[PDB]
Write a protein that binds this ligand. Structure first.
Ligand SMILES: C/C(=C\CNc1ncnc2[nH]cnc12)CO
Ligand SMILES: C/C(=C\CNc1ncnc2[nH]cnc12)CO
Lengths: 485, 485
């Protein structure tokens, strides 16, 4: 009877009256269990998002390169790599981005818990970060838009979404969109994300260049340090097989319904790779590896934001090729939010005939916690679909988001253990999230050619052309041209 | 009453008794209408397959190159292009391949009509030719296997299939395969075929190379003649827009259910491109264009096979990297035939409780008419899924295949009109067939992760790695590893 008296003294306290613990039958233990389940399922993003945004040309630029035998280092030599100053800068930025993402997940999860009494969790999810980490800012200073404007457009989009959802218009704005294009985009983004975690610059290394044909299987061991082409060997890379083993371990966690799956595989691969000396190690004997090991000697640390702190440059909104990014970010956010939260509501005992009793505040918290992320060094956030563990277990009030935020407190003190995760351990998680996103393709009306052609074009043009915007543009254009009357 | 007496004098003739026109209620007019419908739907392959196999490094080799200022032309300079002798050789081979494909479609359609009394049509379909035109023989002499062995493996596979289906084993052989892998392969082959008709060497030219990322949108006009890289311009290619217009015309033929769709778009684009003088023309003012126009001056011709006549080299079955191609061709044929014909049977009034009354001969005719194709210059054939027009209209006997063969007689006399079809008019047909193949993805069990992971891996690894065999191997390996007990 030890649990019963704790539950009832909590319920009769002011917390219980504030959250109405008596109504919507549930106890403190069930809510805590739901919160820990959701955290275990969704904890994979503290490192995945940080690693995605770290190799995305952050504040570090050509001005922070080291000194070489030449007079001054020009552009395309430092951003490529093989330079100590830029590597140290990127290591510091990757160290900072973990704390930035944890703070961005806490601010917004606490808001969703307090302002609205709903059991959800918020953090900067896939999509928008996968969009403006390789398509807008490019890979290490590529593309046309610098990193400063990439946060400015996120701030503008968040403010625009807040304005649009405050006074009621977004309900009538996201309903006129065709039904097939929404699902086609949702599938194409997942396919593109899965494709990203395969190349031999951000993933395991299963795909590379070729002269005659564009893409060829090159999981190859002799790997040129400067660029990444191989001088022999095929499907004998010591790291690719370990990554595949980790992916198999993760995949054999989805069946039999284990609590959290991706995090276990990530930590298994990382723990195996932490061994100093083997050919699969993450700390080599170079001075960079020595510094990384010296920092890893201590397991807990209190890092302070010093590099990518709030710093927004509003001096680039005078040209083209930037407003299109804003338009497509608005489109993607509107596509996601309009469906994910309403679908998530049905699992719980919340959906009513024509209202939700908390929709208005939940939609404003989701958009509201985007300015805080833009002036932090991260991208837009969204209600997580992979929070169904809590709704399946229990808990109908704001003891899920608050406890998730309290757990995320105990996630930024372990920065040394989250900064040395190898790049090849991320790939399996990206592939798994691509599979989960693609799982919805069975809801598309493939019968009539009008929807089938549009869906196929939108799905295909995203991974091949390596740009999310082209798929949406080509889907909308085909749908408009076919329906000309 | 003019039609009635023709119908009854045909029925009471020996043809009617031989085909049992009285039973399986139907008349001569209905069967002829069904045959013309099937021919109009499926006539798109006389030129598509010829164009696919023409730029696949045919008998033409380094020994047929012209004379230049150097002593002798080495390998990688002639097969690339920009040489008169090789261009003339490839033009002659493309001229011959149309007649070869027409003969291969006739022999086998007549057999399916006479030996078995079923209304189907046979021709070398997509898949196997898309496989051994860019993956085995490669693009113009690439890869590891010469063109001579590519026909030898087809002959061996056809003989093996005939032996396997003669004495009953293939019924119990194609049933132990997992259900998800079959559909995953069927979708991946379609995706790969659609991807093929996009590159700027065999398709419209929407996809090309890039340094940082592997694939980038490059529908670009300034196009280097030697290789195909552009020195400026984007999405302003005068031929890409015409190809897109043709694709739209074809797509606005699938709704409203017009008889044949792809052929109309192909002939529209080709007729527009036949104009001499414009920047989109197919006959330029170079001597090659002058010779092509001189041959096009006459509209009808009786071409005789002179280059790729039966010529099989059985001297390469001593090494590796060839038996794997045989195994995967056997796998693909077994995957296709086991489902397409049984599904096609249900539409007609033929399927019974446990038999088909004609399955045994139909399965042997399909495999039997592969040796004749191998010793002709083409690839394996299969019963066409896009013959549903006849079964929907009428006709329950062998007046469909015989009339289809008679029509294919009136398709090789028009070689000049089938040899000058531009390369950019083929792409829309490839994309449309990719859409039709992908349409089946809704039948895959995406619920459980065991099937979803396998299906996603098999679907994704085909277009990215640019090889059909890798997708099948990676699907089978994952399915075997996940189910280890
Ligand atoms: C809505 C956006 C991205 C969509 N991503 C996600 N949307 C919903 N749940 C998730 N879990 C992980 N990532 C996501 C960006 O605004
Ligand atoms: C079975 C094979 C290829 C599958 N291709 C096709 N299978 C069935 N119908 C068709 N129509 C056009 N192409 C096809 C090769 O043996």
């Amino acid at each position: 009877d030890m649990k019963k008296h704790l539950n009832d003294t909590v319920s009769k306290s002011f917390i219980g009256r504030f959250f109405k613990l008596e109504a919507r039958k549930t106890t403190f233990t069930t809510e805590l269990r739901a919160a820990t389940a959701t955290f275990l399922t969704m904890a994979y993003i503290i490192t995945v998002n940080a690693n995605i945004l770290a190799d995305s040309g952050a504040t570090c630029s050509i001005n922070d390169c080291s000194t070489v035998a030449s007079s001054s280092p020009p552009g395309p030599e430092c951003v490529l790599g093989s330079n100590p100053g830029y590597e140290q800068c990127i290591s510091r930025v990757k160290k900072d981005l973990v704390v930035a993402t944890s703070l961005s997940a806490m601010v917004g999860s606490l808001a969703m818990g307090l302002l609205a009494n709903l059991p959800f969790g918020l953090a900067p999810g896939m999509g928008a970060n996968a969009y403006i980490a390789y398509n807008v800012v490019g890979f290490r200073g590529s593309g046309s838009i610098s990193y400063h404007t990439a946060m400015a457009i996120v701030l503008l989009e968040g403010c625009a979404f807040l304005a649009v959802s405050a006074l009621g218009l977004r309900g009538k704005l996201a309903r006129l969109i065709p039904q097939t294009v929404r699902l086609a985009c949702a599938v194409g983004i997942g396919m593109f994300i899965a494709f990203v975690g395969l190349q031999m610059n951000q993933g395991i290394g299963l795909v590379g260049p070729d002269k005659s044909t564009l893409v060829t299987l090159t999981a190859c061991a002799e790997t040129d340090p400067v660029t990444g082409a191989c001088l022999g060997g095929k499907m004998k890379s010591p790291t690719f097989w370990l990554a595949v083993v980790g992916f198999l371990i993760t995949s054999f966690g989805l069946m039999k319904n284990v609590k959290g799956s991706m995090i276990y595989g990530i930590v298994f691969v990382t723990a195996i790779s932490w061994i100093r000396g083997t050919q699969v190690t993450i700390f080599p004997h170079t001075p960079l590896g020595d510094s990384n090991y010296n920092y890893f000697t201590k397991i807990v640390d209190f890092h302070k934001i010093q590099s990518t702190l709030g710093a927004i440059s509003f001096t680039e909104f005078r040209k083209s090729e930037v407003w299109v990014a804003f338009a497509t970010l608005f489109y993607v956010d509107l596509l996601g939010t309009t469906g994910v939260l309403y679908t998530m509501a049905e699992i719980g005992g919340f959906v009513e005939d024509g209202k939700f009793e908390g929709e208005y505040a939940a939609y404003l918290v989701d958009a509201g916690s985007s300015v805080v992320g833009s002036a932090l060094g991260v991208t837009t956030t969204a209600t997580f679909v992979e929070s169904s563990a809590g709704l399946k277990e229990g808990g109908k009030t704001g003891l899920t988001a608050v406890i998730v935020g309290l757990y995320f407190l105990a996630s930024m003190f372990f920065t040394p253990l989250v900064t040395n995760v190898p790049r090849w351990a991320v790939g399996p998680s990206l592939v798994m999230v691509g599979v989960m996103m693609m799982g919805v393709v069975k809801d598309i009306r493939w019968g009539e050619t009008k929807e089938a052609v549009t869906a196929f074009v939108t799905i295909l043009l995203m991974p091949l052309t390596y740009s999310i915007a082209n798929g949406i543009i080509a889907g909308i254009g085909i749908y408009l041209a076919l329906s000309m009357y």
